Design a protein around this ligand. Structure first.
Ligand SMILES: CC(=O)N[C@H]1[C@H](O[C@@H]2[C@@H](O)[C@H](O)O[C@H](CO)[C@@H]2O)O[C@H](CO)[C@@H](O[C@@H]2O[C@H](CO)[C@H](O)[C@H](O[C@]3(C(=O)O)C[C@H](O)[C@@H](NC(C)=O)[C@H]([C@H](O)[C@H](O)CO)O3)[C@H]2O)[C@@H]1O[C@@H]1O[C@@H](C)[C@@H](O)[C@@H](O)[C@@H]1O
Ligand SMILES: CC(=O)N[C@H]1[C@H](O[C@@H]2[C@@H](O)[C@H](O)O[C@H](CO)[C@@H]2O)O[C@H](CO)[C@@H](O[C@@H]2O[C@H](CO)[C@H](O)[C@H](O[C@]3(C(=O)O)C[C@H](O)[C@@H](NC(C)=O)[C@H]([C@H](O)[C@H](O)CO)O3)[C@H]2O)[C@@H]1O[C@@H]1O[C@@H](C)[C@@H](O)[C@@H](O)[C@@H]1O
Ligand SMILES: *[C@@H]1O[C@H](CO)[C@@H](O[C@@H]2O[C@H](CO)[C@@H](O)[C@H](O)[C@H]2NC(C)=O)[C@H](O)[C@H]1NC(C)=O
Ligand SMILES: *[C@@H]1O[C@H](CO)[C@@H](O[C@@H]2O[C@H](CO)[C@@H](O)[C@H](O)[C@H]2NC(C)=O)[C@H](O)[C@H]1NC(C)=O
Ligand SMILES: *[C@@H]1O[C@H](CO)[C@@H](O[C@@H]2O[C@H](CO)[C@@H](O)[C@H](O)[C@H]2NC(C)=O)[C@H](O)[C@H]1NC(C)=O
Ligand SMILES: *[C@@H]1O[C@H](CO)[C@@H](O[C@@H]2O[C@H](CO)[C@@H](O)[C@H](O)[C@H]2NC(C)=O)[C@H](O)[C@H]1NC(C)=O
Ligand SMILES: *[C@@H]1O[C@H](CO)[C@@H](O)[C@H](O)[C@H]1NC(C)=O
Ligand SMILES: *[C@@H]1O[C@H](CO)[C@@H](O)[C@H](O)[C@H]1NC(C)=O
Ligand SMILES: *[C@@H]1O[C@H](CO)[C@@H](O)[C@H](O)[C@H]1NC(C)=O
Ligand SMILES: *[C@@H]1O[C@H](CO)[C@@H](O)[C@H](O)[C@H]1NC(C)=O
Lengths: 452, 452
């Protein structure tokens, strides 16, 4: 059994499904039933959280975290990792056929793990948690960073890494809980953490800030006060006033057994407060989803591009796609109704799958469309809803379950059947279950109908 | 990766865990959390039912049935099959690691499938359903019988079989929805169906009947009238008054690619109306669980032994273990409170795992103990409850979930860790889920504490 998807999907993966730059109407089909490839808990009160999923050209990779006790717990966790392929069934649609399983259960508390599809298997970026996240940010030395390689030949290799730029500049660093990508001999993971304000990186980036504005819902105040507030929002006292910063872990794949990798840190003039995220490669164009952990409540997706150097001076340039369609739930001054800059550590991971390019060779596509799963609430993680959205407004909505159903993290991936032109989107959602407790992570496969 | 369980379980599988013949107290531990090896549905209203599970010395085999639509008809299903091993985790207990998956999805409605662990893989006995079960019993020719062999080398071989004794004697025959066994070059599956009363087998067994009596809850009436009612209870008009009959599909394993197998039919003087069942091999002793589909509401477990012939006249001996502990739910005059002979097609599959021998060379063990999952109701499939039970009474009870939780089929298997003497029982239960609908089949692994 080769680690190869069914041929009708190989050339419909990581492509822009809509490239006419025109307006379109959308319909989200009903969930297509199959044996779920994501295992649930086996107890009513075990914790099962933090999904990470990547569909590559030839196979997919998946992982999440399992705790034998309540989600509020400190002893340790375990990491379920799997890889598999897409197989067409006689029901008329594909299913995710698991081919390899690896349950990392050795007493090491690997946390916040991000997975990526690599030649012949998967790569996983974790940190080893030994204390509270707030303790991480209050300290001055980052936790242990681990890189795990899982191959189809059943080989597993785990290494501790110290990427260039980490030591001396960061109080803490964790993976972005969103899939990384394998791109031009580079393995790229999202990451975020706390930068020491007095360090070299802290002093260099001390005055960097980005303040997106919704023209239809502007924040009240003078430009200077809003800019000062947006700058202050990068240093929440909940995280000991560190500069909370997004970054990219970049590893040379050809040297993946010996390299320590490299931290590429974006300019905070182009990106908001560091948060969970995801790196996508569509039509050989790199995108970065950033969770709206800070005051800005709308969906954050950037077009990104790297400049790689031999000496360790790589850089990344980020370009925000102006999206103000829907808001994510948050608490206090950081709910979905807040649009003004303020110190926030709130929100929830909800990533988007872009169906259209935004920047193309001939210009910019204002008819941008993206799809995903949102939480229909401004304060609470509840009401999972499949959606297709434009830049300014929602195009179509389809709830999953009844109103009042609790849901948290969602990650969405779309691909096309090149045999019959069917467009499939899988919405992987943390759903509250009555029998397995905090989040059965469910992959809902639907067919997306696109018309004029 | 060899298809071999962790060594600490190899000699603790298919053994009698309690062999002192003494009285014991029991405590059922809390569910132990792990990634469930049984996939759920991926839609809120897809059907996922009919679990079959076998734990062999070196590996386990599992299967169940998946319908993209409601459990009511659709007349099209798929069969999920998996095989794997037991692996100890750092959490202190084993988990079930799936090593091979096979999703039979080709438009053939394989139904009521029974799985068995065989050298290098699994064997599955199904029938191809094309109409209602009542239509099967109303007809005069049994449906297609299929045998599927799945090996670790990823080879799948399916054959249509016509076992000796089937044609001319049966209106219909289906597998027993309980695991078969590989024993002395024989592959033995439970089965049941409808015998044509006018056929050779029908006239031979015309006066055979078994009427168990609970000495603590006897049915009132004369012996002869009750005997006539118990004889008539084998011919329900719901199944067109055929003789509903249990049987055993026996295949020569060395000739499994070419043999047609053989129907070994027990005497109905020793067994109740034909129903689903399970074949167990513990300490080289064969046992048969029979679902209480007929009027008798208590747990049916028989010690069985085969006499094999070369010419096709094999026979089976059945010896009922007298159990009157708890009752299964049923409707109408066939509820758990009915103990009088009457025509019944009711009940639910709930099989037992015996912890002790019943018959041994020196005598009979009155301190028999067995464990499983029951439904705490006399009329409704609701309130799944783990239990340890003696012959006459329940020793310990532990509900799963809240009162009012709907549950149907349960199958239980226990094994022992020979490293630390831990006794583990897995209770595989069809549970009603709020997000994946009719029955997430959940494997609940618990530790069983046994004292004096
Ligand atoms: C008492 C309380 O509610 N505390 C919150 C905390 O509130 C504070 C205020 O007290 C303070 O004054 O102001 C700040 C804003 O400046 C803030 O509002 O906010 C915490 C951050 O949201 C929150 O922790 C979060 O709890 C939720 C529970 O719903 C969840 O566990 C979050 O975790 C996840 C997630 O978003 O689901 C998942 C991962 O485990 C996290 N990764 C890591 C590496 O830890 C990830 C991560 O935190 C984010 O990406 C941000 O970096 O988020 C928590 O972040 C406090 O909630 C309490 O503490 C939690 C640890 C948990 O025990 C909750 O049950 C508590 O109520
Ligand atoms: C209208 C109704 O309720 N009909 C029942 C039927 O009731 C009749 C009475 O109407 C009649 O007067 O008297 C007889 C007794 O003489 C009987 O009570 O009983 C049927 C049997 O119990 C029942 O079918 C069962 O329905 C349940 C639904 O809860 C379930 O689908 C059962 O299936 C299973 C099971 O036990 O869960 C599983 C397998 O699919 C079955 N195997 C095969 C090969 O088909 C297996 C099998 O039937 C048993 O092992 C018996 O051999 O049982 C059904 O058996 C009737 O329910 C209706 O018909 C169902 C098919 C379904 O459509 C229900 O929704 C209907 O109400
Ligand atoms: C299992 O597969 C991995 C990846 O395909 C193999 O790893 C490579 O092995 C060669 C040895 O010739 C090295 O030069 C490469 O650098 C390795 N790549 C990585 C990413 O580690 C591994 O050898 C295989 N193991 C087997 C076949 O036993
Ligand atoms: C890096 O990304 C930024 C976006 O943040 C690019 O700047 C934009 O460029 C386009 C096209 O040239 C202009 O229409 C925008 O007005 C620019 N925005 C800003 C804020 O300057 C930039 O071109 C990219 N490349 C480099 C080298 O900076
Ligand atoms: C896969 O495994 C099965 C079972 O281990 C193999 O089946 C045997 O193959 C030999 C080779 O001719 C036969 O003589 C036996 O009778 C087969 N046994 C059974 C039970 O079928 C099969 O050959 C293996 N396939 C491959 C490709 O290696
Ligand atoms: C066939 O099974 C029957 C059980 O139905 C066995 O009969 C029992 O035998 C024991 C010991 O000989 C007696 O104490 C019981 O009274 C018998 N019960 C009945 C109902 O007859 C019988 O021994 C079995 N045959 C063989 C050869 O083992
Ligand atoms: C960031 O923006 C500030 C103005 O707010 C400017 O002074 C600084 O040079 C910018 N830095 C970068 C790297 O763009
Ligand atoms: C949220 O649900 C309400 C129904 O109570 C509906 O009117 C609204 O459109 C939904 N919003 C989103 C973003 O799904
Ligand atoms: C079954 O019992 C009847 C009496 O009810 C008897 O005549 C018959 O011989 C018995 N058959 C067997 C096989 O035990
Ligand atoms: C069923 O539940 C009731 C509580 O309503 C309890 O009294 C009874 O013992 C339970 N029976 C079993 C067999 O669990």
């Amino acid at each position: 059994i080769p680690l190869v998807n069914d041929l009708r999907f190989i050339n419909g993966i990581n492509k822009f499904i809509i490239e006419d730059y025109a307006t379109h109407d959308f319909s989200i089909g009903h969930p297509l039933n199959m044996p779920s490839f994501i295992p649930t808990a086996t107890s009513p009160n075990g914790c099962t959280r933090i999904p990470s999923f990547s569909l590559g050209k030839t196979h997919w990779c998946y992982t999440h975290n399992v705790i034998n006790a309540n989600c509020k717990d400190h002893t340790s966790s375990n990491q379920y990792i799997s890889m598999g392929i897409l197989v067409q069934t006689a029901s008329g649609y594909p299913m995710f056929k698991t081919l390899k399983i690896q349950y990392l259960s050795d007493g090491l508390n690997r946390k916040s793990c991000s997975i990526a599809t690599v030649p012949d298997g998967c790569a996983m970026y974790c940190y080893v948690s030994t204390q509270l996240e707030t303790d991480d940010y209050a300290g001055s030395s980052p936790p242990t960073q681990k890189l795990t390689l899982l191959f189809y030949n059943d080989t597993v290799t785990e290494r501790t890494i110290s990427p260039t730029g980490l030591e001396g500049n960061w109080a803490t660093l964790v993976p972005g809980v969103g899939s990384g990508i394998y791109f031009e001999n580079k393995l790229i993971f999202p990451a975020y953490g706390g930068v020491l304000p007095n360090s070299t990186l802290g002093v260099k980036s001390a005055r960097e800030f980005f303040r997106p504005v919704n023209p239809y819902n502007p924040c009240s105040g003078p430009q200077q006060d809003l800019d000062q507030r947006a700058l202050r929002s990068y240093f929440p006292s909940y995280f000991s006033n560190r500069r909370v910063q997004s970054a990219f872990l970049v590893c040379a794949w050809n040297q993946i057994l010996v390299t320590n990798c490299e931290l590429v840190v974006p300019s905070n003039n182009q990106t908001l407060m560091g948060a969970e995220g995801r790196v996508l490669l569509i039509n050989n164009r790199l995108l970065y989803y950033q969770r709206s952990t800070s005051w800005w409540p709308y969906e954050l997706l950037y077009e990104i591009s790297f400049t790689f150097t031999n000496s360790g001076q790589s850089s990344v340039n980020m370009s925000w796609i102006p999206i103000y369609s829907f808001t994510r739930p948050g608490s206090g001054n950081c709910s979905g109704e807040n649009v003004c800059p303020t110190a926030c550590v709130s929100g929830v991971y909800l990533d988007p799958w872009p169906l259209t390019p935004y920047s193309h060779q001939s210009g910019i596509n204002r008819n941008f469309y993206f799809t995903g799963a949102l939480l229909n609430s401004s304060t609470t993680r509840v009401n999972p809803t499949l959606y297709v959205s434009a830049l300014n407004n929602l195009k179509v909505l389809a709830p999953y379950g009844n109103q009042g159903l609790f849901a948290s993290y969602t990650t969405t991936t779309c691909f096309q059947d090149t045999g019959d032109a069917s467009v499939y989107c899988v919405y992987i959602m943390e759903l509250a279950s009555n029998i397995v407790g905090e989040f059965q992570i469910l992959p809902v496969l639907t067919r997306l109908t696109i018309t004029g």
